[model samples]
Target: KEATWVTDKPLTLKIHMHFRDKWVWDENWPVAKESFRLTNVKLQSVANKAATNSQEQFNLMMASGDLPDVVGGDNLKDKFIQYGQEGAFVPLNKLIDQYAPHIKAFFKSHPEVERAIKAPDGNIYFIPYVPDGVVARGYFIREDWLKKLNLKPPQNIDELYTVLKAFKEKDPNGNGKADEVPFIDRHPDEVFRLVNFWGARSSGSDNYMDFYIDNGRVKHPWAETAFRDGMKHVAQWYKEGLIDKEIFTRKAKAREQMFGGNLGGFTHDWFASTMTFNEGLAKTVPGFKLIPIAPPTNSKGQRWEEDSRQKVRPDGWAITVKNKNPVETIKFFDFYFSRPGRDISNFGVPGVTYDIKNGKAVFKDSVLKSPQPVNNQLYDMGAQIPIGFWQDYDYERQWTTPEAQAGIDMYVKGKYVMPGFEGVNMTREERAIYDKYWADVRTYMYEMGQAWVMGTKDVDKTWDEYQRQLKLRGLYQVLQMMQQAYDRQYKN
Candidate 1:
């Protein structure tokens, strides 16, 4: 009594590269096929190298009508909306609700996802890949430098400044020369890595993107006064030689070289700074101890800064309107949200990829004891299997061992995670306006902000001019639209 209804037809699905969908799809399909008679679903995996940059590649893909049957990736929401308006991609809200009940229930339970999915026009254009765990971004500094200098991690902006000055001048490496950078960041976005200590301020290389919370109103990072103050502080550090000299000119690898050697003090993201930077630095300086810094408290003693625009977009995957079998494609996507599908998507099967001990999933001892290269390679490959697409909090807890899970639990409890802004779904008209306005505004802001930081332009003379240029570039109009969208979406 093989169920023929769901298993009768084969569904063809096209997904992005680096996402190992074949294995997980194979694992979960038997149950779906048996019950629903959906059979012989052939999934085609296509790697689009050009899709790396969110705006350009997607626009080109849509314009050329070269979009695949189903697409998923990092930044596809805006594109989904743009094309959905032009009938290039179909709306999935109804389809998702009907075929993907688990996903629908999940979003219904989580208001954050619910709010994020609805555009300004109240149409749901795509699906978001929901990450189940907390991903906190913070500082990683040289413990060896701190120990050599007899300094503690700074608690406030002033303390940080004083410590950075000491790191710059004190020659903590004892190499007999002033060769250390107290703080270093290549882009302005990395600046946010430090400036949250001053209060709510934007630090990363993306200067035009603002973040603020004033009088219960979420403010863009560009609109915040703390942003200017933070930039001025960084400029002052740059002027005094407390920050990396190559911060403005060099890329990440060059900056990492500085941090890797006994040459720099602080950087952002431990995985990058400690793991990647340290690996490169280890060949040169053997005993470096890159340590994690506690997330800083501001001058006002506030420790957490909210990123209001941190929500995941609902443009992860959708069947193109051009696809012949939209119903089958939607059903295939629905299978991904099931319990078995989620387990295989995040961590490999318990026996093959990981092992279960007393009902807790653990990595094989071989994985734990191996060197970084081998282990990393294995993890990378395994991630492509069931680990890339599936994400469930309980599955994650079950799959990850005690030590790894502790760090995850600590981050969630710390309230460091923030949700993205909801209700700013752009219409085709709005997208058209944004495409023109944002490009100009972002370009000018980056150019001017760089000049300000590098001391190539006087901040006082250029600051007003920058604002005027933003106005000319229609920044206020964009902000007003965003604010209106926010109000309309969340004001209930």
Candidate 2:
């Protein structure tokens, strides 16, 4: 055994990469060495150029076959599927099952991931990166303001309008100044969150293609009367000054300040918005509480359709078959999904970043008190550890300390937040077509939808134009592809 162990020195794996979350994938050399020493790896650095359109630049790279060993970000699925068909990226199904036992087991346990990763042709080509829950997209409201005004949380469109009116005129903050904005969302293109309340279900892709699954069949939402009715309601809101006036011109920081000082009544995504707004509102407004609100229901007592983007995908990692040391690479990558591996990636080395007690993982006191400031530089440099498949591990045992756990528990119990869709197991062919059509449809729909929300375009006059533009961009073809993929992956 000793002779066998000594027969080969540790394998040194050379990795090509891209920026991931701040904690994973250290870009700096010294930090990478210190953080990933157990893997016996060396990273070659390349400066990522700031481009006019990053997607266009990436497309050039993919078309040129100049991709590194690893790549991260959205929109790689279609390129991978196209290139993989021509043998640009190697399929890793066999390597994953044999060497990546932790990852393999995770997919097996979560059938959704398995379904998501498989291409229409039945190959898993890429790995998916995801957070554990569906809470990333939702509504946020000022609970303190709601209480001060003795108002109940709005549950439907009618109630939502009433609440917005009260927020705008009643001086809900009791400042004796009528300065409150009932709602503030991103302008022009980023206003889907508001328009969706009116029954316009946006396709995740571009081109304003609207579709929804009804009784297991995909139907275009734009054709539905509800979408038009929803727009009318938004127009009403805009005319009444319930919607933000500077929506089209206000920058993100301005939006944050609008909500932070309790001047805005509602917005999207509690975590993303609350982290920006209300960061220190406790000092400005005593008892300021940014509460995550459940999605509002429609006139028919139905909330917006569930976002399909929450499913997890199986195609997270792949190995270049042409590499010099495929086995070593597989082994190194496998470590990221293991118990110890996930711990190192998510929490950092125990004692250094976290500690294990009675089989439960806990962060250091300093880390818990200030997770951002303490770990900011480490994460920025990618010196932090990697956490893959955060759902598989005992999160309580692997990431959060007791103090952190309390907050986590409180959030889960109170907020009803859930995970977003995972894109791990989409088949190669499905990924290809979805990549082509999703963006265009999403862009067109968002633009038209925002126009409806802000009353910028006459809803009746522009609705037909929106549909025409969507057709020009091949919205129907994208919908057909999605319906086919969803049927095959989910129903079959």
Candidate 3:
């Protein structure tokens, strides 16, 4: 049967993301209204009856088999796939082939995206949100501080050390107390990300989260020589007072406090939020400026933006076994992939939050300049929610400052951004092997890395023992499983 444009029955949906409870869907929200106008598919969100979090709610719904027509979220992927295999959710391949022209075309064009959403069983169970940006973390430095000290941005690891040393000794903040930390990050492990400067993948990549492909083989940082070399340099920096002494203990607010107090010189962080510091701090601190710079090249002359966003966001939605009108539901899911659907989901209503200016969707100043985060503000208007919609970076450009856009452009032009490794599937046996050993290996590696960076453990003295411990913990077995999964994912 052809998918109907106007259905009398509304589909029930339970969509949950990391902060799903923070926003509620309203019929009047632009996406809800506009999508209904186009597809006549009324999506009724299921109420969160008693569960504290969406995870709890999801658990309750799954256990009871009292599912909504659709279920989706950020925290539910593994379980979603597991349930999909067990017939709790619909396998989308046939429906997508029969009813979803837009989604079918999307899959045809982006084969990698198609591969990402398929399960180890070779079934497509979810429609993933396509991210607009690839670069996740940028190396930001206090440009005003650099100017104050008459120093240029660092180009390589050695120059980075020299620049950091100057920030430590030059009184660049001009507060006259020698209180500048020179380098600061929210977490100690973020400090460990410097190992990437030496081509080590220990701190984890944004997409893969635990492993990286080294020379076509799955590798972990603890097993690599580069990790040791990187740790030694980092430890030397911490010993020389170039790194924040309290980096291990700093809370979320440390970034705000350190930058606002005119103490932070440089850190690696998100380009958007990091750029916002320039706006907020300029009001209080005279000539305050934080700017994105290229990541420093390592001794091997390699520089990479390793923390790239996954092409497919972890957020997505899947039709459930309870859905009565599978064709209509699939068609509705397909709507978000269409141009109009993409626009409404990304930029909101054409005349409300945004408008066609110079043939481009330009957000109003009110939407762009809102005190709340852009995504939060957009969520209220039924845009940028994690509902398996294609996120257009053009929508982001409409809100981001020129400096932020320029920073992204710089990395992209330099060909520095690396592909994110996600969506690889493992067999039941492979997963079992990975789960058994990966947890202990990751914990030990992180602890040792922190210890080295803090100067509490000598990298040279303990490096051999660390490698031995990883091997004993089945690091090789885990790596072999990961290698199989990776090969399966990318096999041409």
Candidate 4:
């Protein structure tokens, strides 16, 4: 059985939701707020760390040591990890193993997760909400355009090159103005995701930190031999009319207009790139469809999708050292892990958010089918269990229909997330070093990558100096710290 809570007296608890709990700002607790009262415990005075920006408040709370019993949100994590390493929070491993049977078992099956949650000192200070395996990002192509040109979705990068060439030359949009750009990404970095098709996981749109795990080592992609080859291929496409002219400068809404207006042929983005951006395209252009494709492989057939990129989530809940009873708090969270507890937390009070039928939580068609819908119910989508086992099973499938299933499945296929160490937060020393030199180096790498793509610089001529500068900027020290942290957690 899961851990159960029965406190001897009403437990006055303070919960902080700096980023995750949006409703908590107005004291608008979600439907499962009612579940806090059990046999002998009660929750009260939910103080919200709500503001437009909460980093200041988080700093104030941590500096003053005036923390609530628990905290929620992504913004709180770095601070939590920082303070946790410095003995500001209670380490929960021993306490959890003694009092939390369900959680203990959940973690036993995922010892890697144990390492991911560990601080530099080799102990967990928070409970992170993780989705076992879920897709986070993907690429979408205009299936109707492919059909119009009598072409299939490219199975490999070489075939994709052919298709892109055809898109540039074929007048597939039928507008007769040479107006169609085969691929239009919001930024140059996004277009460089074409490198992922070369059997390498490239950093995503508008974000240029390209540190990837290669054989348990942080790889500098821009410094790789294959990276130059990929850049050459992408540069060829950019000059040959396959890539959009405004790709480097366009903002998100401007880039989305290409899909909405039926001009974009392919895009590297999340599932919503096809679903949300092109929702109106069908009515505007009859038989128009944007579709997800299984990620194309390189000529050599290696997939470098890193698992860290696709963890359903990495941060969520944490108990502060201020909590009087970690045992009861663990029990309170275990209720969320149980079926009955998950039901209320995710689906809300049954019929209101969903209906319990056939021993499953089925959400209302009103919310699911609405042209514009908010979250599943109030705070979360399904049962608010601690581990995401049942919530994982019910949430996505319950919310979507057969029409969208293929795209959803294709989206999942595009995720090349392979197994690796995901959590490795920097210690204070590491952070200071990162601030001193690493950020500058990462930016220079991005600029040099852009220079190569724009044909302004030759890779071979500059490769030696690039490596020199990278080394001079403390790359070895940065990675040595990362390697040390990984060994402590995964190796130990």
Residue-level lDDT tens digits of model 3 in 46-120: 646334366666676678746778776664556666778889988999999988998899899999888767766
Candidate achieving the largest TM-score:
3
Per-model RMSD to reference: 5.9, 5.4, 4.2, 5.7
Q: What is the TM-score of each candidate against the true structure?
A: 0.76, 0.76, 0.82, 0.72
Tens digit of lDDT per residue, candidate 2, span 1-492? 221121144544333333321112334544455334656554443324343443464456555545556543434555555556667667767878887776788778876766555555666666654345433345667777789889989988788888989999999877899989888864333344455676555443221243456666666665456677667877788789887777766744445467656678887632432443343465666676666565677666556533322444222445544566665565666666666556555555566656888775566765545424333423553423222234332432333344334433444565433223232234546556666776776666666766776677887887777778877787777667767766775687
* Candidate 3 accuracy as lDDT: 0.76
lDDT of 4 by residue, 194-266 (tens): 7666655565212244465666666656667777667777777777888887777674455447866667788
Model 2 alpha-carbon drift over 4 Å, by segment: 1-25, 29-35, 44-57, 63-65, 134-138, 170-179, 185-190, 203-212, 220-224, 238-241, 244-256, 270-280, 303-309, 313-323, 371-436, 484-492
Per-model lDDT: 0.56, 0.56, 0.76, 0.62
- Looking at model 3, the pairs that clash are none
Residues 1-492 of candidate 1 have per-residue lDDT tens digits of 233223355555665422221122232332322323333555565545434344454455566646677655545555566667668778877887787776677777876676565554566666666655445345566777777778887766667777778888888878889888777655545643445666655622111254333444645565456666666766776788876767765543445467556787876542322344444466667667665554566776776434322334333666677687877766666655665455444445455556666665465655443334222333344332221133555443433434334434555577654443333545545656765676577667767767766788876666777778878898777766655545655575
State the local distance difference test value for candidate 2: 0.56
Question: Which runs of model 1 end up more than 4 angstroms from their true locations?
Answer: 1-12, 16-54, 174-178, 185-188, 203-213, 216-218, 245-262, 270-287, 299-301, 304-315, 348-352, 356-361, 368-379, 382-390, 393-436, 489-492
**Comparing candidate 1 with candidate 3, which one achieves the higher TM-score?**
3
Off by over 4 Å in 4: 1-26, 29-69, 75-79, 134-136, 165-192, 203-223, 232-258, 269-285, 299-312, 322-329, 344-349, 372-391, 400-466, 483-492
Better of 3 and 4 by TM-score: 3
Q: For candidate 4, which ten residues in a row score worst on lDDT?
A: 381-390
